[PDB]
Design a protein around this ligand. Structure first.
Ligand SMILES: CSc1nc(-c2ccc(C)cc2C)c2c(C#N)c[nH]c2n1
Length: 208
């Protein structure tokens, strides 16, 4: 069943900072998560220009936004390259130790939280609006895994059973009680239009 890991001290810190720092422009979380999905989809793309059997786990390269009012969740699904178990543990494939260093320094020197994606740690912006984040992932080589964290210094990794996905990553944001605006069609559309309107892959906003 479930393995528990300690975040590296630098990530544990960034996350406390993201969670605790007063910052009203929370919406940038969606641009950062769509920008990582797009990066993951560029990667599966690049790979398949030399090995087309890579697209056998699925040819459609896209991004879905799925809000669920009853579960209070907003899910970003992509059919990107996915992460193997080691990717997920090595904090979701990021240089997060060195990025938090560069980021926390960039903040000292006049940056604001909205620039987080320049240091390749934009994922953690999910903790502006979510109390809990589950990342379900499937890379061609490996199993389907679930990663989960409610911050506080640890995360879990397990094998995910059932809901097979073929290839990619889902980020499920369990929203905080007072960030439910991010479940509204109108607000999601406004934010994609403000910050993500020239992404290179179709983004579909699901209706409830
Ligand atoms: C390289 S495969 C991959 N990785 C990520 C991702 C990247 C970095 C981090 C810290 C976390 C995730 C889930 C996403 C992601 C996010 N966030 C959305 N799709 C993704 N696909």
């Amino acid at each position: 069943e479930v393995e528990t890991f300690a975040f590296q001290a630098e990530i544990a810190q960034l996350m406390s900072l993201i969670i605790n720092t007063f910052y009203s422009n929370k919406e940038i979380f969606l641009r950062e998560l769509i920008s990582n999905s797009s990066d993951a989809l560029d990667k599966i793309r690049y790979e398949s220009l030399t090995d087309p059997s890579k697209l056998d786990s699925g040819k459609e390269l896209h991004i879905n936004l799925i809000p669920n009012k009853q579960d209070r969740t907003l899910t970003i699904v992509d059919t990107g390259i996915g992460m193997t178990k080691a990717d997920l543990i090595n904090n979701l494939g990021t240089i997060a130790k060195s990025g938090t260093k560069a980021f926390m320094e960039a903040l000292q020197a006049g940056a604001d939280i909205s620039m987080i994606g320049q240091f390749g740690v934009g994922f953690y912006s999910a903790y502006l609006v979510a109390e809990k984040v589950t990342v379900i992932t499937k890379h061609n080589d490996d199993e389907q895994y679930a990663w989960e964290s409610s911050a506080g210094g640890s995360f879990t990794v397990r094998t995910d059973t059932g809901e097979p996905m073929g290839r990619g990553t889902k980020v499920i944001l369990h929203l905080k009680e007072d960030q439910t605006e991010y479940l509204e069609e109108r607000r999601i559309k406004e934010i994609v239009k403000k910050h993500s309107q020239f992404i290179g892959y179709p983004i579909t906003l699901f209706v409830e």
